[PDB]
Symmetry: C3
């Protein structure tokens, strides 16, 4: 119930230093972020690439290897959220602004420029390589972190923290030791920079749309603060205000506005061409899955390092930053699901929705390029979605609807992050003081502004460089959550009696052999 000042103070100091450094000295901060990315991507990029696909293997195995039957709670327990409602709150908190910002930019960018090891103007690899970054590899990080927290919190009954998930690996003395503190600090620093990156990427696109919709003429440096201040003041209140409906209501407004914007483009846009990419993109994704997972800085004659540092290694570092707080939320909602249900509900359902979104939006953008109409414009990634919407008839009203979607796809996740950061500040208490939950909401905004204003002309690169550095320390925490998780699952109360017999029989068999050899 205390404030665990051994976790708040180290996390505040790093956050405050970034705000002072980024805002105070823009030139120095930008150079360090560029230098830090090169060292991280060069000497550590293999870790993201190698372990990014180990998570997918590890999770699928855990969902079939004798543990899919265990239940995240007590035996005979039942889920407190109906399946349809349960799925809605996980994709709303799981996804922020990644289907809006990159829904059109990414599949279109790979169509024009191409991907390393391939040619340009290829719709098979433009779409398949987009599904690679948004279907299984990213959502397998949430399952691993969410499952480790869900099991320890419910089956074993420990505090709601990320250190407690490591009790098997570092014992109970280490959960209160220097390691327990460090694992918890890295979960807040990752979350603050993980959300601040998506706040900065959503403030750019909301401001970009206003120029399109002409509510405003063009974004300015003060406009970004205005958008961030409104977005910050929205999720900060929605998290810590009893008035209004909870996250289960907002999580349902997301899936309604998102389906409104997807159905509009699907119907108005090239329906038949969109429907043809759905099998072609899934078929190309499954045949190229391992070929794409084996792409490193050594691929394409060693020239793919620059591409990976902006597309793959950024996404993997981005999703890992959101895992510490999207794992804790996913744990809260399950409370009764079996390991198989949790794994297959997180891996397959969010992956199916992301497949349809990118074919409706990525397919429309690519189809426009083939036809002759090009929504690329000046190339800015923020302006591409609204250039597509405005091309379609009736897009003026939908351009406005896309803003509410942009704002409401970050509020659902940002508010959950604050309430999840608040519980780490205390000793895993579900109820968090509204002041610490509001204090962390401001921290993401202060970082979100710092990464945007400091970036200047190129604010995307600065927002992406800092995320990769802030997520590298927590990449290893996720790797060590695979070993901690298996130790917990093996030492289950429904396996202790069976494991004791094997320990006894194994000891005797060794004793018989050593004595038998002498005789």
């Amino acid at each position: 119930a205390s404030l665990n000042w051994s976790v708040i103070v180290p996390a505040l100091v790093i956050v405050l230093a970034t705000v002072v450094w980024g805002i105070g000295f823009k030139d120095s901060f930008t150079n360090f972020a560029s230098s830090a990315l090169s060292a991280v991507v060069d000497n550590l990029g293999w870790a993201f690439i190698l372990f990014g696909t180990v998570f997918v293997f590890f999770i699928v195995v855990i969902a079939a290897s004798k543990f899919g039957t265990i239940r995240l709670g007590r035996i005979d327990e039942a889920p407190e959220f109906r399946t349809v409602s349960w799925i809605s709150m996980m994709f709303a908190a799981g996804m922020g602004i990644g289907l809006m910002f990159y829904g059109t930019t990414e599949p279109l960018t790979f169509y024009r420029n191409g991907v390393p090891g391939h040619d340009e103007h290829n719709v098979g690899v433009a779409m398949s390589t987009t599904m690679f970054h948004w279907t299984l590899h990213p959502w397998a990080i949430y399952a691993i972190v969410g499952l480790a927290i869900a099991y320890s919190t419910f089956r074993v009954g420990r505090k709601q923290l990320l250190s407690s998930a490591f009790v098997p690996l570092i014992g109970e003395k280490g959960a209160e030791g220097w390691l327990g503190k460090l694992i918890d600090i890295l979960a807040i620093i990752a979350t603050v920079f993980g959300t601040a990156c998506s706040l900065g990427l959503g403030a750019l696109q909301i401001g970009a749309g206003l120029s399109a919709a002409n509510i405003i003429e063009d974004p300015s440096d003060w406009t970004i603060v205005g958008i961030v201040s409104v977005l910050t003041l929205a999720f900060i209140f929605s998290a810590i205000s009893g008035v209004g409906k909870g996250i289960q209501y907002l999580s349902n407004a997301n899936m309604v506005l998102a389906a409104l914007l997807a159905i509009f483009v699907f119907v108005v846009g090239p329906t038949v061409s969109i429907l043809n990419l759905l099998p072609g993109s899934i078929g190309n994704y499954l045949s190229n899955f391992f070929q794409m997972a084996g792409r490193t800085a050594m691929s394409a004659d060693g020239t793919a390092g620059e591409w990976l540092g902006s597309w793959t290694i950024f996404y993997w570092a981005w999703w890992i930053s959101w895992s510490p707080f999207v794992g804790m939320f996913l744990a809260r909602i399950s409370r009764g699901r079996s390991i198989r249900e949790f794994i297959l509900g997180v891996l397959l359902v969010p992956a199916g929705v992301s497949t349809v979104w990118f074919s409706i939006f990525g397919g429309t953008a690519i189809v426009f390029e083939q036809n002759g109409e090009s929504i690329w414009g000046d190339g800015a990634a923020e302006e591409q979605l609204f250039g597509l919407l405005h091309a379609l008839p009736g897009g003026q009203i939908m351009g406005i609807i896309a803003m509410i979607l942009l704002g409401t796809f970050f509020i659902t996740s940002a508010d959950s992050a604050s309430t999840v950061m608040g519980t780490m500040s205390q000793h895993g208490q579900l109820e968090a003081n509204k002041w610490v939950t509001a204090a962390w909401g401001v921290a993401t905004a202060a970082i979100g502004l710092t990464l945007l204003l400091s970036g200047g002309d190129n604010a995307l690169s600065n927002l992406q460089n800092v995320t990769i550095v802030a997520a590298t320390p927590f990449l290893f925490v996720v790797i060590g959550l695979m070993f901690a998780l298996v130790k917990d699952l093996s030492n289950d109360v429904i396996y202790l009696e069976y494991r004791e017999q094997q320990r006894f029989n194994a000891r005797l068999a060794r004793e018989r052999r050593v004595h038998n050899e002498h005789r």
Copy 2:
């Protein structure tokens, strides 16, 4: 039993509407079919491609899930057919003219012309594409349709109708009024138009068999009528008459005769080159399985649209239209057989026989092409097999036995279609009227003839256009069968007791949560 006159008449009107429209207005029928094919392929082409692979995935998780152990019948039941004789009737009924007609022409056509997104003269792609069209995607449609009927008929004791398999979705009342009747005429129309495509294709190859054997000099239009007339008598006599050991003897004769012609080509032909292709075709098939499963009209920079309508979408429509009556037959001969045992038996064993078949005949044809001696000839698909056989020693005598095998590969499947069609008009009576079984056999021959005389030179094109159109309505019945199947399986007696406790506990937990939220909500 009482004839289902509410299904015979609406289905018979479609059949007779096409016959008069085809013989009398050949000029206007071909135009409509070609225009209909364009409308279907352009708009619903993705459906065949997208859901042709969901069937493979759906019937693999079903076999691998907890439903695999279920037994198609009571618990403690045991199959009534020797597992060897179960396969023989499974393959004999499930396959007809296909292997004989496209055994040589498909692998050779892809070797010369190539496939979209690939170069010509590529043996790996040529062989790994004909295995795609004939191994797992086609036989996964039979398993889904056959399993839905087998489960409802035996495990749940409903009537043997395609409507009854939808009771989980539309209910016992929906399955009777108007949706059930629609699903029961779309199944008869698909069966009539799916078996008429095989009859037309078989008559074309039989006519070429007599030209190559020189028994007939020139196949005119009055000999095709002679061939179809003999064939339609063959499977009407077998279907209705109680003598002759209709099945388990003519189905066992098909393996004996099918293997005799495969062994002849294997040993007389390039045996070592055939065996070198066998591991290369399977390896290439599994490597490119998902590249071919995602080949839509957007492939080859938009050039694949015309290719798919001739090979991929035609096959998926050809197999979709045969699944109403193959699935119904596979249910009867698979009583007491578990779900996993049923799915693996259908998916794997028939897929293995096809793989060996196309290596011996596709490999021999491709090997000849490389050497310099080409059996392509003029390029008619109906004359390739006999061009291959006559290029080997002893082919003259062995070309006559290919025609007999060609006929017997239709009779074993056409007689089971007429019998199943009669059952669909007897409210599911296993033994239907002889004059309803025979009437439906004559209907199949009438349409098969109408699509040959109407086409003229492009007889094959007219047969493929109509099959795709007739099998489009049933594409959605198969999509719906895989939604009513999981509900049927889920609501099983063995799982019913456990489900009730889980629902009961879930309601309490949900109610407990909402109350706690209210208690915290107030203050």
Copy 3:
């Protein structure tokens, strides 16, 4: 206790005839080997390739199947060796000089020359095709043979022979009769020529290692005779006097030191960029490489396959008879599923990391420009690589000591096993019977090395393919024999007995119903 002279004599005649033939008439022996090699590769090339992949499929399906839980021994038994000590002795005994000889020659050869159907200078396929030959296809033959012997010996109580694992097919009378003596003769000839092929290659690399290290001025045919004789006594001494566990652990520690040396002082980061780039490519092309016959590349693959793929498959099949009975001996009380995974995966993991450190470090040198190819002799690639790295003059000698233990641990277990197939499956075989087979292996090793002249590699390869062809069909027949007696387990007869009775009634009812209705 008897020596089964009716199996020893036929084995000796084939072994002795080869020694006289090769030494007596080198020209005739070399000409016959080339003629026989072409005859087998053309006619039976598909058999090695077609059934090479069926072994991988067959073993995974058996571990997946219900049989996976059957325990090799009595119900509720426990293993005699710790999992780490059991793993260490399976790899040391199952791997001879293959990793040392081809650690740098194979991945580097494919980078320069390419592979059938692919362009040259491709690091992706150089490493992906290198792991094809050393990860799953090879180690799956060991599990098929090791499992058939382990199951029949322990869970059925039959004598520890290769013929005793065939009684489900040939019957008890057949195994005692003639077919089961030819299976024992072929099981001896294959292991004599397989172990002599690796002894020949080991002597070439040690002979080249001495010349490179300046210990011996030049490599002379009379110098190699000294190496083989010295190597002959080491493994004969270990299998006779009063061991395996100690030397198998000295293998792993000493080998891991050599791998750590190259890893640390080589391009560490570039090595790690290939760890996921080779696993991704391996899984991508697994079925493209698994379906590579002589028909691939339009007849150009026939000459390549006989040198790389069909050679390895015949080389690993040669070692299966005696690695099968060694794997069975130490795997008492392990479940079938635990046996398959402990053999297929862990040795594949060590091989995958071995070639990345050594194949990667040799390919980067090619890319940089400093090529270690030199003259191009396969036996000099390793010592070119080590000398390039700093400190490779002391680590270039430990490679030769590591070439001794690698062969000695496997050769020590070959003689012990070869002396058991002659004494009616008696574990404690006569000391002189092991010695007799120990020097018969050395005589064959020299015969192929001397008769080969300048091209000693081709003579060793052409004769192991012919010697391992008869035993290709014994492994193909072990899949059927293994399935026959796995089904007929004590924990399935009651279930199988009831099912057959019910099925017979169902057939009887149908036949009676048919008569009633047919009338």
